[PDB]
Design a protein around this nucleic acid. Structure first.
Lengths: 56, 114, 155
RNA sequence: AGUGCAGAAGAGGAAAGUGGAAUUCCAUGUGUAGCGGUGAAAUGCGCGAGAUAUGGAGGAACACCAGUGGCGAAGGCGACUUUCUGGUCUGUAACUGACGCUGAUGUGCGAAAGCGUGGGGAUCAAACAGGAUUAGAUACCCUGGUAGUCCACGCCGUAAACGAUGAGUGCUAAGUGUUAGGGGGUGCCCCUUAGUGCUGCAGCUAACGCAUUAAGCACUCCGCCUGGGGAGUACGACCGCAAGGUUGAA
């Protein structure tokens, strides 16, 4: 549905994101498996820099 | 005992460490299940922790703590009797952090009784 | 007894004393089923108590029950996973019907020779506290007045 | 058919650890009566450990995109800053005009441990130091405790390789979950040139199960099997760093 999102973005990954800094399961979501895989992947290219926490 | 307190309470299934402190580690007061006589499966139990915080708040006699902004870490069933009963002078359990022991599967586990 | 819910099944009637608790204890003290004998012990032995003991057992019968009846009981009732007893709420048929036998098991206690006068000596040093009849009530009632247990049980 | 192939997948594989579960260590921002221990306690850190984390880099794993998904012949399998790498082929096949099937020669190679560098402790786990037991414990129980737990180099192979399924030719309802990727196409209907797991027509096997995507019926090889043990014990022949194998009448 959306176009690409990459490690430029780290909060366009907040739609599907938790409160600890992780993301919700794809089974509870349910959209373009391919598009959502890379989109969520980039946020993990960002847990590299870890802009989103692990615990507070 | 500086006119306020901060609750760094703890409860492993044994030795429910009720610990109302100040912000730094300046050692206000502590408590226990091993402080009021209970051993026989009344250690972490709601009917054995009715007065588990007054071995702290009235063995203070000068503070009467007034808030928490708590970090309820080291969780058990003794948690609840260590919070709701932390309101016996005005100690005002106010805020929480949702940060208990949540390690990340990097540890190695102790053993399992069948 | 698959069911239960059984009452006292009796309309407690009294002779010439005008009471509903002086007829439910006449059969308890009734030595070897002796109606008149206990009837004469509740109209001549329970009326001359003041002459021997000190006070009469007419309107002071409430002080020989209310000032001795305990509350917390001691009945095994497994709950959760351990083995701790739980007290039952002192109900009228479970506190006044069982807490009125303080004259049959205490009649053979007073060591004042005359057993008849010893049975009338159960009103003295027992109507208040620290007596020979409330000595077994302080070793039961006072055992769970501070140590609370399960409150979400069945009994 | 194979190389052309859009390339494209999934934990197919090789990617240092910048950062983080950073650990039982402790003066500690902080201090002492507890980090903590249990069928039954001593175990056990306090004559100046503590509670969680202020410097907290590190021994290290991606912890969270992580699903049963799917690369590959079984053993597998997880961010990547990505160092590289094939085939697989999903659509028809451009070239050549049989472009050959099970495959004892060879080679062989394949689970933690058993194996090779010294690192060898983050220190848990073997032994167990040790409590304790209903009539009955060195014990699954219990803090801690010396291989190992942190491995880039010699070669391997026993396991429920319980996958107990060996591989050529199609197959008598196809739908179905659907797979990156697609024959007609254009969050709208799909068929195998396809792939999986199947409820299961239909028909066989042996009581059972397979099923348009077959143990059934038809051409196949290394073959084993043809009532039980005992039997791998006399003995044994040849590989071999090692567990060892791998043989073999009674």
């Amino acid at each position: 549905g959306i176009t690409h999102i990459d490690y430029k973005d780290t909060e366009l990954l907040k739609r599907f994101i938790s409160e600890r800094g992780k993301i919700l399961p794809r089974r509870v979501t349910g959209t373009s498996a391919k598009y959502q895989r890379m989109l969520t992947t980039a946020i993990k290219r960002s847990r590299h820099m870890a802009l989103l926490p692990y615990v507070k | 005992n500086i006119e306020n307190g901060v609750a760094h309470i703890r409860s492993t299934f044994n030795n429910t460490i009720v610990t109302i402190t100040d912000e730094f580690g300046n050692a206000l007061s502590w408590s226990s299940a091993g402080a009021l006589g209970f051993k026989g499966s009344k250690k972490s139990t709601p009917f054995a922790a009715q007065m588990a915080s007054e071995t702290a708040s009235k063995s203070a006699m000068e503070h009467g703590l007034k808030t928490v902004e708590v970090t309820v870490k080291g969780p058990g069933p003794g948690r609840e009797s260590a919070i709701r009963a932390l309101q016996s002078a005005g100690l005002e359990v106010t805020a929480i952090r949702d940060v208990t022991p949540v390690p990340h599967n990097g540890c190695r586990p102790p053993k399992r009784r069948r | 007894p698959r069911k239960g819910s059984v009452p006292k099944r009796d309309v407690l009637p009294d002779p010439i004393h005008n009471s509903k608790l002086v007829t439910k204890l006449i059969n308890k003290i009734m030595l070897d089923g002796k109606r008149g004998t206990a009837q004469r012990i509740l109209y001549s032995a329970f009326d001359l108590v003041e002459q021997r003991s000190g006070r009469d057992a007419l309107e002071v019968f409430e002080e020989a029950i209310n000032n001795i009846m305990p509350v917390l009981e001691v009945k095994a009732r497994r709950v959760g996973g351990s083995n701790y007893q739980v007290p039952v709420e002192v109900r009228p048929e479970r506190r006044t019907t069982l807490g009125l036998r303080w004259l049959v098991n205490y009649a053979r206690l007073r060591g004042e020779k005359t057993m008849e006068d010893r049975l009338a000596n159960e009103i003295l040093d027992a109507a208040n506290n620290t007596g020979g009849a409330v000595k077994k009530r302080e070793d039961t009632h006072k055992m769970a007045e501070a140590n609370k247990a399960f409150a979400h049980y069945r009994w």
